[PDB]
Design a protein around this ligand. Structure first.
Ligand code: 1R6
Length: 355
């Protein structure tokens, strides 16, 4: 999959994007890779922040669906006009597919002033597509229309320019060390997973595990931070504060690598009563602006770039599971390294999920 290695770019905190083409003749656009949503949407009008935009008038293969659409994310939102067109990924598989495309015609706090992307590729499932689950997401269209296998993987590498790889249809073994460990996708909407235990410096947070997944835990390449439910964030911060008593930092805030604690999330494994743990280092959760990149949520745990930059993450849709392995590009020192380890014995893991 050599041609797909290093096909991701971005600036820190502004997301990771891949080059795509849309229309005939092909119009090149940079498109955010977002496992936390399910719509393919591109700027279609001359917003002043945009380097370029989709011009439907130039495409002979454009088809109008004569239907509006609107997607609000955590912070921004857009509305637009649904249609279909031919799409490919220059540094992806050698194929062209007819996909649904939302042409964005109005937006608020969505495009970023100074960013180098013009659209978003929602890689999650139909259940959360707008306006409804009948709007087939891109990856579903790709798998339907080609022989591309039903999985993709992400190696997000970080550094204020960032880089990475999206391997569509497979796994590049040179991008990770050790073994992949798989956690089940609990339900196909977001990439929802179940966290069964949390350790700060190998010390259990000792919370009811249901709190870790209240109301969701998801894997989201579109989110920068590791986001934790407040009751879990509260307990997480408390322990991180204690762990790091050598120095004091102000309340609002919430290089000496060895002073900061590693954080371990234990994830439901593939077998009854079996889990595994992923562990990140301070170099993952201390990101240059350093800013502390763990935050509160009312919408559950979001394993964003802070988690994903430690690991090669395989979205094995075919088998309804997500794989984690230590990333071959992750930043580490002579002392410590990000880790994926197992098996562990964990009882009542099905009770950790919220209903
Ligand atoms: C289906 C639409 C939708 C609606 C709500 C929503 C989500 C998705 C979940 N995923 C959010 C993710 O899709 C978006 C994508 C995005 C949108 C605009 C810009 C960018 C990314 C790039 C910049 C990344 C910075 N950043 C983006 C988001 C959140 C935090 C954050 O730091 C964001 O909304 N990401 C994340 C959650 C579900 C749990 C919280 O909320």
């Amino acid at each position: 999959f050599v041609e797909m290695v290093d096909n991701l770019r971005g600036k820190s905190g502004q997301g990771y994007y891949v080059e795509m083409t849309v229309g005939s003749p092909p119009q090149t656009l940079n498109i955010l890779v977002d496992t936390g949503s399910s719509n393919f949407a591109v700027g279609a009008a001359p917003h002043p922040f945009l380097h370029r935009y989709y011009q439907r008038q130039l495409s002979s293969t454009y088809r109008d669906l004569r239907k509006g659409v609107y997607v609000p994310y955590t912070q921004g939102k857009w509305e637009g006009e649904l249609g279909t067109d031919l799409v490919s990924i220059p540094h992806g598989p050698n194929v062209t597919v007819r996909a649904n495309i939302a042409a964005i015609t109005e937006s608020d706090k969505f495009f970023i002033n100074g960013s180098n992307w013009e659209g978003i590729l929602g890689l999650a499932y139909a259940e959360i597509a707008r306006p409804d689950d009948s709007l087939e997401p891109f990856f579903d269209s790709l798998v339907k229309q080609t022989h591309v296998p039903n999985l993709f993987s992400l190696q997000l590498c970080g550094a204020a320019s960032v880089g990475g790889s999206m391997i569509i249809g497979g796994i590049d073994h040179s991008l990770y060390t050790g073994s992949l460990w798989y956690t089940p996708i609990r339900r196909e909407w977001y990439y929802e997973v179940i966290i069964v235990r949390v350790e700060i410096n190998g010390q259990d947070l000792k919370m009811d595990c249901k709190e870790y997944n209240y109301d969701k835990s998801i894997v989201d390449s579109g989110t920068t931070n590791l986001r934790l439910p407040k009751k879990v964030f509260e307990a997480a911060v408390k322990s991180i504060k204690a762990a790091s008593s050598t120095e004091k930092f102000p309340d609002g805030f919430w290089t000496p690598w060895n002073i900061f604690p590693v954080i371990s999330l234990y994830l439901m494994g593939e077998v009854t009563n079996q889990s595994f743990r992923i562990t990140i280092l301070p170099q993952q959760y201390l990101r240059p602006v350093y800013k502390f990149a763990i935050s509160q949520s009312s919408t559950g745990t979001v394993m964003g770039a802070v988690i994903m930059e430690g690991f090669y993450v395989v979205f094995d849709r075919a088998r309804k599971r997500i794989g984690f392995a230590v990333s071959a590009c992750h930043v580490h020192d002579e002392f410590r390294t990000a880790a994926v380890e197992g098996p562990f014995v964990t009882l009542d893991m099905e009770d950790c999920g919220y209903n």
